[PDB]
């Protein structure tokens, strides 16, 4: 629920959460922060799994955050999120 998140200076809600996410779709990943207008890091293809450490809610989505090989932080949207209602869309993959 929202009660477990903190909020940063851009209004992004965030918390620590460690799990694995396997994509069921091609999902574009971002650099710099959880905004689709940010530079594109690349994509998860269906069946690819990443291990994340932080969850955020910003720019209409729930995102998870992980570190790439070079140490770049990569922001992956995993479902839609409506800020005013906290309503979540279906997950774009599997969490385990
Ligand atoms: N939403 C802000 N400003 N900070 O996040 C923490 C708020 C805390 N869970 C509370 O409910 O008071």
With a 6 Å cutoff on the Cβ, whether 11 touches ligand 1 is no
43, 1 in Cβ contact below 8 A? no
Instruction: Please compute, for residue 63, the number of CA atoms within 13 A of its CA located in the half-sphere on the CB side.
Output: 25
Ligand 1 mean position, distance from CA 23 (Å): 30
CA dist., res. 48 & res. 72, Å (int): 18
Cα-Cα-Cα-Cα torsion 11, 86, 65, 52, nearest 10 degrees, comes to 150
Ligand 1 mean position, distance from CA 47 (Å): 35
Ligand 1 mean position, distance from CA 36 (Å): 25
The experimental method, as deposited, was X-ray
The resolution, in Å, is: 1.5
Can you name the residues that pair with 62 across neighbouring β-strands? 57, 79
Q: Residue 3 CA: which ligand 1 atom is closest?
A: 9
């Amino acid at each position: 629920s929202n009660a477990t998140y903190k909020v940063d200076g851009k209004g992004t809600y965030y918390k620590a959460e460690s799990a694995s996410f396997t994509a069921n779709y091609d999902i574009k990943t971002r650099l710099n922060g959880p905004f689709r207008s940010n530079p594109q890091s690349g994509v998860l293809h269906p069946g690819q799994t990443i291990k994340y450490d932080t969850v955020m809610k910003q720019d209409g989505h729930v995102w998870v955050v992980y570190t790439g090989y070079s140490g770049k932080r990569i922001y992956l949207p995993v479902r839609t999120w409506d800020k005013n209602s906290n309503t979540l869309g279906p997950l774009w993959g599997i969490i385990n």
